Design an enzyme around this catalytic site. Sequence first.
Site, PDB file in Angstrom:
ATOM      1  CG  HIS A 202      -1.945   1.111   1.214  1.00 19.12           C
ATOM      2  ND1 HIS A 202      -3.108   1.064   0.473  1.00 19.12           N
ATOM      3  CD2 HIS A 202      -2.002   2.262   1.930  1.00 19.12           C
ATOM      4  CE1 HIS A 202      -3.841   2.131   0.739  1.00 19.12           C
ATOM      5  NE2 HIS A 202      -3.191   2.876   1.619  1.00 19.12           N
ATOM      6  CB  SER A 206       0.657  -2.395  -8.271  1.00 20.16           C
ATOM      7  OG  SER A 206      -0.244  -3.043  -7.398  1.00 20.16           O
ATOM      8  CE  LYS A 228      -6.886  -6.495 -16.651  1.00 18.97           C
ATOM      9  NZ  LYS A 228      -5.701  -5.603 -16.777  1.00 18.97           N
ATOM     10  CG  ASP A 229      -9.049  -8.462  -9.081  1.00 15.84           C
ATOM     11  OD1 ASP A 229      -7.992  -8.749  -9.696  1.00 15.84           O
ATOM     12  OD2 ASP A 229      -9.064  -7.665  -8.118  1.00 15.84           O
ATOM     13  CD  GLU A 272       3.592 -34.037  -0.393  1.00 16.43           C
ATOM     14  OE1 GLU A 272       4.474 -34.930  -0.527  1.00 16.43           O
ATOM     15  OE2 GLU A 272       3.454 -33.395   0.680  1.00 16.43           O
TER      16      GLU A 272
HETATM   17  C1  HEM Z   1      -0.793 -16.119   0.283  1.00 10.01           C
HETATM   18  C2  HEM Z   1       0.143 -15.387  -0.474  1.00 10.01           C
HETATM   19  C3  HEM Z   1       0.077 -14.092  -1.023  1.00 10.01           C
HETATM   20  C4  HEM Z   1      -0.921 -13.176  -1.150  1.00 10.01           C
HETATM   21  C5  HEM Z   1      -2.398 -13.235  -0.708  1.00 10.01           C
HETATM   22  C6  HEM Z   1      -0.397 -12.083  -1.937  1.00 10.01           C
HETATM   23  C7  HEM Z   1      -1.143 -10.998  -2.403  1.00 10.01           C
HETATM   24  C8  HEM Z   1      -0.665  -9.939  -3.173  1.00 10.01           C
HETATM   25  C9  HEM Z   1      -1.479  -8.897  -3.758  1.00 10.01           C
HETATM   26  C10 HEM Z   1      -2.995  -8.673  -3.567  1.00 10.01           C
HETATM   27  C11 HEM Z   1      -0.673  -8.169  -4.555  1.00 10.01           C
HETATM   28  C12 HEM Z   1      -1.124  -7.110  -5.547  1.00 10.01           C
HETATM   29  C13 HEM Z   1      -1.616  -7.647  -6.888  1.00 10.01           C
HETATM   30  C14 HEM Z   1      -0.563  -8.464  -7.621  1.00 10.01           C
HETATM   31  O1  HEM Z   1       0.511  -7.896  -7.944  1.00 10.01           O
HETATM   32  O2  HEM Z   1      -0.827  -9.661  -7.900  1.00 10.01           O
HETATM   33  C15 HEM Z   1       0.674  -8.629  -4.327  1.00 10.01           C
HETATM   34  C16 HEM Z   1       1.828  -8.052  -4.851  1.00 10.01           C
HETATM   35  C17 HEM Z   1       3.117  -8.563  -4.706  1.00 10.01           C
HETATM   36  N1  HEM Z   1       3.447  -9.726  -4.043  1.00 10.01           N
HETATM   37 FE1  HEM Z   1       2.217 -11.003  -3.163  1.00 10.01          FE
HETATM   38  N2  HEM Z   1       0.943 -12.294  -2.192  1.00 10.01           N
HETATM   39  C18 HEM Z   1       1.236 -13.548  -1.691  1.00 10.01           C
HETATM   40  C19 HEM Z   1       2.483 -14.164  -1.752  1.00 10.01           C
HETATM   41  C20 HEM Z   1       3.640 -13.600  -2.286  1.00 10.01           C
HETATM   42  C21 HEM Z   1       4.896 -14.292  -2.468  1.00 10.01           C
HETATM   43  C22 HEM Z   1       5.094 -15.773  -2.134  1.00 10.01           C
HETATM   44  C23 HEM Z   1       5.768 -13.399  -3.007  1.00 10.01           C
HETATM   45  C24 HEM Z   1       7.142 -13.565  -3.345  1.00 10.01           C
HETATM   46  C25 HEM Z   1       8.076 -14.474  -2.748  1.00 10.01           C
HETATM   47  C26 HEM Z   1       5.032 -12.172  -3.214  1.00 10.01           C
HETATM   48  C27 HEM Z   1       5.532 -11.030  -3.837  1.00 10.01           C
HETATM   49  C28 HEM Z   1       4.804  -9.898  -4.205  1.00 10.01           C
HETATM   50  C29 HEM Z   1       5.356  -8.744  -4.859  1.00 10.01           C
HETATM   51  C30 HEM Z   1       6.852  -8.495  -5.073  1.00 10.01           C
HETATM   52  C31 HEM Z   1       4.317  -7.949  -5.217  1.00 10.01           C
HETATM   53  C32 HEM Z   1       4.370  -6.636  -6.020  1.00 10.01           C
HETATM   54  C33 HEM Z   1       4.258  -6.924  -7.503  1.00 10.01           C
HETATM   55  C34 HEM Z   1       4.295  -5.668  -8.341  1.00 10.01           C
HETATM   56  O3  HEM Z   1       3.525  -4.729  -8.067  1.00 10.01           O
HETATM   57  O4  HEM Z   1       5.074  -5.623  -9.302  1.00 10.01           O
HETATM   58  N3  HEM Z   1       3.726 -12.327  -2.814  1.00 10.01           N
HETATM   59  N4  HEM Z   1       0.647  -9.776  -3.574  1.00 10.01           N
HETATM   60  C1  LIG Z   2      -2.318  -2.128  -4.894  1.00  7.48           C
HETATM   61  O1  LIG Z   2      -2.663  -3.463  -5.195  1.00  7.48           O
HETATM   62  C2  LIG Z   2      -3.774  -4.225  -5.007  1.00  7.48           C
HETATM   63  C3  LIG Z   2      -4.505  -4.238  -3.717  1.00  7.48           C
HETATM   64  O2  LIG Z   2      -4.154  -3.574  -2.744  1.00  7.48           O
HETATM   65  C4  LIG Z   2      -5.696  -5.068  -3.616  1.00  7.48           C
HETATM   66  C5  LIG Z   2      -6.393  -5.021  -2.266  1.00  7.48           C
HETATM   67  C6  LIG Z   2      -6.118  -5.823  -4.674  1.00  7.48           C
HETATM   68  C7  LIG Z   2      -7.382  -6.764  -4.636  1.00  7.48           C
HETATM   69  C8  LIG Z   2      -7.107  -8.060  -3.835  1.00  7.48           C
HETATM   70  C9  LIG Z   2      -7.429  -8.286  -2.562  1.00  7.48           C
HETATM   71  C10 LIG Z   2      -8.139  -7.212  -1.708  1.00  7.48           C
HETATM   72  C11 LIG Z   2      -7.143  -9.590  -1.704  1.00  7.48           C
HETATM   73  C12 LIG Z   2      -7.667  -9.504  -0.284  1.00  7.48           C
HETATM   74  C13 LIG Z   2      -7.876 -10.652   0.597  1.00  7.48           C
HETATM   75  C14 LIG Z   2      -7.272 -10.926   1.847  1.00  7.48           C
HETATM   76  C15 LIG Z   2      -6.233 -10.011   2.511  1.00  7.48           C
HETATM   77  C16 LIG Z   2      -7.604 -12.186   2.733  1.00  7.48           C
HETATM   78  C17 LIG Z   2      -6.923 -12.560   4.088  1.00  7.48           C
HETATM   79  C18 LIG Z   2      -7.221 -13.968   4.510  1.00  7.48           C
HETATM   80  C19 LIG Z   2      -8.215 -14.650   5.203  1.00  7.48           C
HETATM   81  C20 LIG Z   2      -8.073 -16.159   5.432  1.00  7.48           C
HETATM   82  C21 LIG Z   2      -9.497 -14.012   5.790  1.00  7.48           C
HETATM   83  C22 LIG Z   2      -9.962 -14.429   7.173  1.00  7.48           C
HETATM   84  C23 LIG Z   2     -10.976 -15.478   7.143  1.00  7.48           C
HETATM   85  C24 LIG Z   2     -11.553 -16.307   8.076  1.00  7.48           C
HETATM   86  C25 LIG Z   2     -11.234 -16.334   9.575  1.00  7.48           C
HETATM   87  C26 LIG Z   2     -12.625 -17.322   7.709  1.00  7.48           C
HETATM   88  C27 LIG Z   2     -14.026 -17.064   8.189  1.00  7.48           C
HETATM   89  C28 LIG Z   2     -14.607 -18.297   8.672  1.00  7.48           C
HETATM   90  C29 LIG Z   2     -15.913 -18.696   8.780  1.00  7.48           C
HETATM   91  C30 LIG Z   2     -17.097 -17.803   8.369  1.00  7.48           C
HETATM   92  C31 LIG Z   2     -16.377 -20.062   9.325  1.00  7.48           C
HETATM   93  C32 LIG Z   2     -17.872 -20.302   9.128  1.00  7.48           C
HETATM   94  C33 LIG Z   2     -18.380 -21.578   9.641  1.00  7.48           C
HETATM   95  C34 LIG Z   2     -19.159 -21.913  10.749  1.00  7.48           C
HETATM   96  C35 LIG Z   2     -19.603 -23.325  11.114  1.00  7.48           C
HETATM   97  C36 LIG Z   2     -19.692 -20.922  11.767  1.00  7.48           C
HETATM   98  C37 LIG Z   2      -5.381  -5.794  -5.897  1.00  7.48           C
HETATM   99  O3  LIG Z   2      -5.776  -6.463  -6.816  1.00  7.48           O
HETATM  100  C38 LIG Z   2      -4.212  -4.973  -6.036  1.00  7.48           C
HETATM  101  O4  LIG Z   2      -3.611  -5.016  -7.263  1.00  7.48           O
HETATM  102  C39 LIG Z   2      -4.247  -5.066  -8.532  1.00  7.48           C
HETATM  103  C1  LIG Z   3       6.137 -28.535  12.735  1.00  7.23           C
HETATM  104  C2  LIG Z   3       6.632 -28.423  11.302  1.00  7.23           C
HETATM  105  C3  LIG Z   3       7.719 -29.079  10.820  1.00  7.23           C
HETATM  106  C4  LIG Z   3       8.600 -30.023  11.614  1.00  7.23           C
HETATM  107  C5  LIG Z   3       8.236 -29.012   9.457  1.00  7.23           C
HETATM  108  C6  LIG Z   3       8.139 -27.959   8.612  1.00  7.23           C
HETATM  109  C7  LIG Z   3       9.205 -27.535   7.689  1.00  7.23           C
HETATM  110  C8  LIG Z   3       9.710 -28.228   6.637  1.00  7.23           C
HETATM  111  C9  LIG Z   3       9.717 -27.761   5.186  1.00  7.23           C
HETATM  112  O1  LIG Z   3       9.654 -26.467   4.664  1.00  7.23           O
HETATM  113  C10 LIG Z   3       8.970 -25.571   5.437  1.00  7.23           C
HETATM  114  C11 LIG Z   3       9.754 -28.958   4.194  1.00  7.23           C
HETATM  115  C12 LIG Z   3       8.315 -29.260   3.786  1.00  7.23           C
HETATM  116  C13 LIG Z   3      10.720 -28.731   2.914  1.00  7.23           C
HETATM  117  O2  LIG Z   3      11.121 -27.440   2.745  1.00  7.23           O
HETATM  118  C14 LIG Z   3      12.467 -27.371   2.534  1.00  7.23           C
HETATM  119  C15 LIG Z   3      10.003 -29.262   1.654  1.00  7.23           C
HETATM  120  C16 LIG Z   3      10.553 -28.677   0.349  1.00  7.23           C
HETATM  121  C17 LIG Z   3      10.092 -30.796   1.682  1.00  7.23           C
HETATM  122  C18 LIG Z   3      10.654 -31.443   0.482  1.00  7.23           C
HETATM  123  C19 LIG Z   3      10.654 -32.944   0.585  1.00  7.23           C
HETATM  124  O3  LIG Z   3       9.398 -33.507   0.598  1.00  7.23           O
HETATM  125  C20 LIG Z   3       9.221 -34.860   0.663  1.00  7.23           C
HETATM  126  C21 LIG Z   3       7.932 -35.401   0.683  1.00  7.23           C
HETATM  127  O4  LIG Z   3       6.859 -34.593   0.665  1.00  7.23           O
HETATM  128  C22 LIG Z   3       7.764 -36.806   0.730  1.00  7.23           C
HETATM  129  O5  LIG Z   3       6.463 -37.325   0.757  1.00  7.23           O
HETATM  130  C23 LIG Z   3       6.323 -38.663   0.417  1.00  7.23           C
HETATM  131  C24 LIG Z   3       8.878 -37.692   0.754  1.00  7.23           C
HETATM  132  C25 LIG Z   3      10.167 -37.196   0.724  1.00  7.23           C
HETATM  133  O6  LIG Z   3      11.250 -38.058   0.752  1.00  7.23           O
HETATM  134  C26 LIG Z   3      11.206 -39.068  -0.187  1.00  7.23           C
HETATM  135  C27 LIG Z   3      10.409 -35.748   0.701  1.00  7.23           C
HETATM  136  C28 LIG Z   3      11.768 -35.136   0.677  1.00  7.23           C
HETATM  137  O7  LIG Z   3      12.805 -35.816   0.716  1.00  7.23           O
HETATM  138  C29 LIG Z   3      11.800 -33.682   0.612  1.00  7.23           C
HETATM  139  C30 LIG Z   3      13.167 -33.016   0.593  1.00  7.23           C
END
Ligand code: HEM
Ligand SMILES: COc1c(O)c(C)c(C/C=C(\C)CC/C=C(\C)CC/C=C(/C)CC/C=C(\C)CC/C=C(\C)CCC=C(C)C)c(O)c1OC
Ligand SMILES: C/C=C(C)/C=C/C=C/C(OC)[C@@H](C)[C@H](OC)[C@@H](C)CCc1oc2c(O)c(OC)cc(OC)c2c(=O)c1C
Lengths: 385, 385, 245, 55, 125, 93, 93
Positions: A202, A206, A228-229, A272
């Site tokens: 923020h 972007s 668009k999303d 996996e």
């Molecule tokens: C659960 C995971 C994640 C969520 C919900 C998330 C969400 C977002 C959102 C909403 C944006 C803006 C829209 C977009 O550019 O797609 C963003 C931008 C970005 N995210 Fe993530 N992200 C996640 C994981 C990651 C990871 C794993 C990386 C890198 C290791 C990462 C790197 C970035 C970067 C660098 C940007 C800026 C891109 C740009 O504006 O050029 N994000 N992310």
């Molecule tokens: C400047 O850049 C942006 C940007 O800022 C945004 C916001 C967006 C749009 C995208 C988003 C807003 C993504 C937002 C979403 C999140 C941050 C989600 C966080 C994660 C969660 C898991 C939410 C929390 C949820 C729960 C606790 C679950 C609720 C559970 C329930 C209701 C259980 C119900 C069941 C029973 C039995 C009672 C863009 O696209 C973008 O670039 C184009």
């Molecule tokens: C309480 C939490 C705990 C202790 C652990 C969390 C942290 C660990 C990790 O990262 C966070 C870890 C997942 C790792 O990351 C480097 C992954 C890339 C794992 C890669 C991985 O997978 C395998 C797998 O899935 C298998 O299935 C059948 C079998 C496997 O052998 C044959 C492997 C294996 O040899 C390796 C290197």
Amino acid sequence: MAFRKSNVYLSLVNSYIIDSPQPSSINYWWNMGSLLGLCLVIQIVTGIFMAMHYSSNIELAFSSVEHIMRDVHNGYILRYLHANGASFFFMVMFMHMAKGLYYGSYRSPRVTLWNVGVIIFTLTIATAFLGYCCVYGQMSHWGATVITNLFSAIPFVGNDIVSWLWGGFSVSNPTIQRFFALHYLVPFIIAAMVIMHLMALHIHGSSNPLGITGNLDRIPMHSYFIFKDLVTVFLFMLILALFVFYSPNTLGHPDNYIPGNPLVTPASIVPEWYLLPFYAILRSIPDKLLGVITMFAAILVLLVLPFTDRSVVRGNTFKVLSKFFFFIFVFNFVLLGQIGACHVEVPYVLMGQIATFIYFAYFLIIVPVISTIENVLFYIGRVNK
Amino acid sequence: MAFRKSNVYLSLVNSYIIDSPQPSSINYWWNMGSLLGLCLVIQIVTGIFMAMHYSSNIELAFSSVEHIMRDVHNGYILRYLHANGASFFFMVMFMHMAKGLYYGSYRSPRVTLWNVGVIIFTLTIATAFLGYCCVYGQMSHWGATVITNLFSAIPFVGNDIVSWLWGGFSVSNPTIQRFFALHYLVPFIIAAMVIMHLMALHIHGSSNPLGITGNLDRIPMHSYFIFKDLVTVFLFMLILALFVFYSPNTLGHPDNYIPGNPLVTPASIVPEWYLLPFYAILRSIPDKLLGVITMFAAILVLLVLPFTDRSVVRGNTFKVLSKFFFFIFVFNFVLLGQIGACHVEVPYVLMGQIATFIYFAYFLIIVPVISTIENVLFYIGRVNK
Amino acid sequence: MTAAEHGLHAPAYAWSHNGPFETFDHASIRRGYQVYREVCAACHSLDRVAWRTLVGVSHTNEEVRNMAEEFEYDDEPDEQGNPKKRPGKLSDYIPGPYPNEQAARAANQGALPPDLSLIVKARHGGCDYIFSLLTGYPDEPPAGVALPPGSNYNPYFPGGSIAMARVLFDDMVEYEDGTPATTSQMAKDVTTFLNWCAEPEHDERKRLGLKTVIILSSLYLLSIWVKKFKWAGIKTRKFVFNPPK
Amino acid sequence: SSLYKTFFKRNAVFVGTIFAGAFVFQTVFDTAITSWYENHNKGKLWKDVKARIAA
Amino acid sequence: QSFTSIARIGDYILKSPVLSKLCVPVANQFINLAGYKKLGLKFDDLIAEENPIMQTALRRLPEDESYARAYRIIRAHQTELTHHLLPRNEWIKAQEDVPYLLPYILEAEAAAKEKDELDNIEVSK
Amino acid sequence: GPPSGKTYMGWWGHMGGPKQKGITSYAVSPYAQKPLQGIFHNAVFNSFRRFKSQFLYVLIPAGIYWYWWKNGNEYNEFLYSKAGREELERVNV
Amino acid sequence: GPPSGKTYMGWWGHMGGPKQKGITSYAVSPYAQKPLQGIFHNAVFNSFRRFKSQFLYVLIPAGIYWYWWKNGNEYNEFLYSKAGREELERVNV
Ligand code: HEM
Ligand SMILES: COc1c(O)c(C)c(C/C=C(\C)CC/C=C(\C)CC/C=C(/C)CC/C=C(\C)CC/C=C(\C)CCC=C(C)C)c(O)c1OC
Ligand SMILES: C/C=C(C)/C=C/C=C/C(OC)[C@@H](C)[C@H](OC)[C@@H](C)CCc1oc2c(O)c(OC)cc(OC)c2c(=O)c1C
Ligand code: HEM
Ligand code: HEM
Ligand code: HEM
Ligand code: HEM
Ligand SMILES: COc1c(O)c(C)c(C/C=C(\C)CC/C=C(\C)CC/C=C(/C)CC/C=C(\C)CC/C=C(\C)CCC=C(C)C)c(O)c1OC
Ligand SMILES: C/C=C(C)/C=C/C=C/C(OC)[C@@H](C)[C@H](OC)[C@@H](C)CCc1oc2c(O)c(OC)cc(OC)c2c(=O)c1C
């Protein structure tokens, strides 16, 4: 002012989702982040409803999941959504990361944004592993065994960590019960890290495909990018639906429909699919300690890119050599995964060791060398003295 | 500027915890909120570590808690911290609420702050009930039975809600497994509501014991109130420690050391102490529907106080009649709880019905009448025409 | 790895349930149950299948009740606490041939016949594999292959050496519906039955998928149109520059 | 199109009409799909097998 | 990488007629493949600006060049979002693709380097 | 309020761009524009352009890696057939 | 940045109070002050004051409710003893 601005809760919504100024030119590659938030929601909602029917005892865990499959109304839909959704969560995360790599999104002033992203990635990998163990099929048991054993490589106090993680002599009831408890927790920590991710997003906004400033032409999030999303949200759901209903087990492993057996490791054990490139990297090093160090380093080396990218322009759009080597990196990564799926046999062992080298050489050698060369090429092609 | 200000994450910490301008004169009654955050942390941490050893199956739940008590290293400490901490969580919440009542903290411009507080209170009550059921002692089973049955009072579709909540014909395995899953979830929703609570707190700041503006003399949170908070944090821990180690079962019910029995309701059944005033209110109405309506209304009527407090000054510090009737309210509330602990017998039934009236009359009648009278008394005591 | 160690790739048969719009053939399921009862059940448990799930799938409410009552299950102790038995009811799970693992190994040269409730999903190749295994015992092993005593050869099993002998032979079963009980017919039927055991939700799952995919497809095509409309002002926007004096 | 301007007359469709249309859709669509599906699978269903058994 | 350093390496190549005749054709072809001229951009429009050197430099740009950079950038974003290139007669020609911001950048880097040198000067008696 | 770190993006009215002068923009309501049966005829020979520039950057690395994969696989197949068991003994340990 | 609703508290330098003039404050470092063996002698007959004002507001409602509780309890005890089983029959249903 408008209520959406003046109210304490709504103004957050307004500044992030409604009035947030977006660069006019961002393309569909910038839709992945919203798809990741959606994925996080799908995983949490389906997991909670399944938890209502799940037993974590090592005697009951596999049958309690069969119970969800057979007896719970729409139970197979919940389980298949969760399992296939985890895979889709990784597909989209890789694309989100690859997007960042290509367009120089890791660069200043978005380094903090990138670093928090790398943490989320580690947490997401750990979360999926914890969930995979909860099924307690054959792949669950040996996955839990192999991965907890990663820590035994730690000097002196390593086997102590492992027995502490296990809660006993081997992967047993203590282990699976604590892995369920942890699997429930970490999604909420990921949610808090996503908020920290959006906070850093923020303050700078972007980036865009040209790699230059977006300040001269913004359009509001609301309407334009909300709808668009929506386009990619539905396409995402369509494809996820095709797997969940028509091909629900294509992305998993048949051995995890066999209850875990502490005395027998199947010859057919394969990680996996989304863990295969990393697995291959570890397998390529014929040493225990160095195998696990190199594999972890393959994740941490992502942190190095803001420093080794020496270029003076953000992103690869106008860079001929960088585009080429980027795709070398991508397809090298796919190869690493295809090697992971293969047997430890002649051509494959060497190919994996070379692909491993290429993986690290990209960040540490190719990008610094090539970006320097491109810097100089841009200069001498226009300066006449 | 200083890094604690310029950094995106630290500035949040700075504006809430370090540089946050506090009114110089707030007294130790303003320490309860930090004690509530501490309570929330104690409950979550001890619950997660116990979850690692807990089985939610109705056959195993009670024994799995005995297993935590007997076999888990320091398991009895975790369980007794959790159980006694829940009680301490309510003691401190009542004091936090009573503080708000006395000092007019519910008043404009802090109405939103108060309303979010009432939601947290409802959620906290529901969370503790879900946890209490997880033990599956005798009080667990019949608590689950009685409280899920609250919804059967709903016109036409009430018994359908109940069988849906149960997952079958009665409180059974489906019920206890889903109540554990829900008990794990709701603490995190409470955490998100606490953040919303602190957001509304931040835009107007704390009130103070004089009921007037704090704007003319602020001192920073850091140092002064950080270390003042520490004083009550340790006193809180000391007392919680005396219960956990020296008297761990004094605040519970002996019947919950008996496994739940679907065929027998003990004659000695009594609700948890913090639910007794509300229980008494329900028991005072000799009608099913109206009993549960009146009990819920006893919580919602808290929402009415910003409108029925007609006074022109915030708080009771300089108000003789309001102070007196406030303490009538408090001790009336204690009586309601003492009635709840008693048998449905002659003097008690009537006393409970009168105390119930006094409870509602306070918000709806006494406060509007008395605050109007005090308004006029303040005027005619100084104006000479 | 060597072809023998991998096992022979099972080919793709034209199962009538293959394809997005195709339900199971329920007559084949009915028959497959008989083949399971009369041949396989002597060595193979089916622990995860309850009698009630047969009703409305392959058998009537009445037929299943008769089948369940042919078996005895442990009941609640009498008024005095002595154990007692009970005919089976629809709530019961199909009982297995052996009381424990050790008794199952004793009756099979030390080998353990897996439960078949999930066997179609717990093997690469699915129906193709199971069918091919059952119909793929050669009368003699290929030349040079030295089989362990008590083992059998089957090219589709990894390593070739399997502890289950061929058990399907022509007309060892009298199909209640008149169908010629050839070995490949019986294989086709149990395998169809075992796919249902592993995937009881199959027919309903594909019906729901058809609705879900139609709605989501439409929503996808629709959102494209709505997006283009909402973007038309921006996409056709035009700029002119007149450099300032 | 002038089919739109007869029902909704240059105004957008309102939520109440949308919600109401959705309840109608749900039932109609389900019957249309179940019908096609059961027909496409004629012969294979339990419905069809039960017609050839009696005891 | 600083522009002072890119200029060092680049000028060394540009003077020595061994390298100058070898590299510049490679560089010329790289620039055409880059494609930014088809969007109406000059290379200097492409330099990442979110740092103090580039903000100093852009601040010091004469008005008329500043308004021109602004138009070229806005026009580039609009064309990018339509997934087109400009009409070829609108492309930037090589004669126009001048390093207009380079002198301001180099000047600011030198000023900055001197401050860093003077803040850290040692003294000998 | 609580202070604030300087960034490289502001908000509407102070985005942080340079001062703009001389640029004039024009647009037309989506409502006044042709319902979406336009694209095609005017725009399908247009696009399918941006991948003439790109396909080589993708295809050549793809080609290199697919060739390299196919080769190593066919070699492994040979090694574990009868014909190759002699070479297998050589290259193995 | 993103705008902001007007509140009744600002921050250091603009708290939102009225303009202050004429008030002068003085203080002395905690370091320069008597180590905490002071209070007492000067301050214990001082406090225990603020509850002379208050104790009646607490005590009188407390008294009313304790009396009312003790009475109802002793009555219930009588009702369920032998002596009161006649009155019990009367007041019950
Ligand atoms: C659960 C995971 C994640 C969520 C919900 C998330 C969400 C977002 C959102 C909403 C944006 C803006 C829209 C977009 O550019 O797609 C963003 C931008 C970005 N995210 Fe993530 N992200 C996640 C994981 C990651 C990871 C794993 C990386 C890198 C290791 C990462 C790197 C970035 C970067 C660098 C940007 C800026 C891109 C740009 O504006 O050029 N994000 N992310
Ligand atoms: C400047 O850049 C942006 C940007 O800022 C945004 C916001 C967006 C749009 C995208 C988003 C807003 C993504 C937002 C979403 C999140 C941050 C989600 C966080 C994660 C969660 C898991 C939410 C929390 C949820 C729960 C606790 C679950 C609720 C559970 C329930 C209701 C259980 C119900 C069941 C029973 C039995 C009672 C863009 O696209 C973008 O670039 C184009
Ligand atoms: C309480 C939490 C705990 C202790 C652990 C969390 C942290 C660990 C990790 O990262 C966070 C870890 C997942 C790792 O990351 C480097 C992954 C890339 C794992 C890669 C991985 O997978 C395998 C797998 O899935 C298998 O299935 C059948 C079998 C496997 O052998 C044959 C492997 C294996 O040899 C390796 C290197
Ligand atoms: C009845 C037609 C029948 C079926 C069907 C069947 C299937 C079957 C499968 C699919 C396996 C698993 C093979 C694998 O691991 O891929 C399997 C294994 C064994 N069986 Fe069987 N089986 C049928 C019938 C019989 C009968 C009647 C017996 C006992 C005489 C029998 C035994 C076994 C044994 C033993 C195995 C273990 C194989 C091994 O571990 O090598 N089966 N069967
Ligand atoms: C980012 C979020 C999550 C991810 C990536 C994730 C991933 C997974 C994975 C890979 C599995 C195994 C899938 C399989 O069956 O093959 C799993 C199982 C499971 N998960 Fe999650 N999960 C997440 C969140 C949750 C949450 C919050 C809960 C809530 C309790 C949960 C509960 C479960 C349960 C009950 C199982 C066992 C059922 C099953 O096998 O599908 N998960 N999860
Ligand atoms: C606001 C937070 C919480 C409150 C008020 C709360 C309250 C309670 C209560 C009243 C009980 C029964 C205590 C007893 O044994 O008599 C209980 C039990 C339990 N709680 Fe919580 N709880 C909270 C959070 C959590 C969380 C996040 C978890 C994590 C899983 C959790 C897990 C459990 C478990 C495992 C039990 C059964 C063990 C036991 O009986 O102590 N609780 N909780
Ligand atoms: C888990 C529960 C809660 C947490 C962590 C919490 C925390 C806080 C904190 C840190 C403060 C500032 C310090 C203080 O005045 O004590 C505060 C103020 C306040 N809270 Fe809460 N609170 C909680 C529940 C509630 C409830 C249940 C209510 C009322 C129904 C409420 C009403 C208020 C009000 C009105 C104030 C302002 C008091 C004033 O400044 O005069 N809170 N709370
Ligand atoms: C203007 O008024 C104020 C004011 O604003 C503040 C802030 C304070 C000071 C008080 C506070 C700052 C309270 C703050 C606390 C919270 C908001 C807490 C929120 C709740 C939580 C539950 C935190 C989240 C925690 C977790 C997810 C638990 C972590 C779990 C772990 C580590 C599991 C570990 C175990 C294993 C096996 C890995 C005042 O006192 C005050 O008035 C005087
Ligand atoms: C999935 C979640 C679900 C379905 C339920 C959550 C919501 C319900 C509540 O509030 C949120 C609810 C706790 C209520 O609030 C009005 C409390 C004051 C309950 C008061 C309460 O307690 C009892 C209790 O504890 C018992 O134990 C042995 C026994 C009881 O009979 C004898 C009662 C009882 O008669 C009442 C009224």
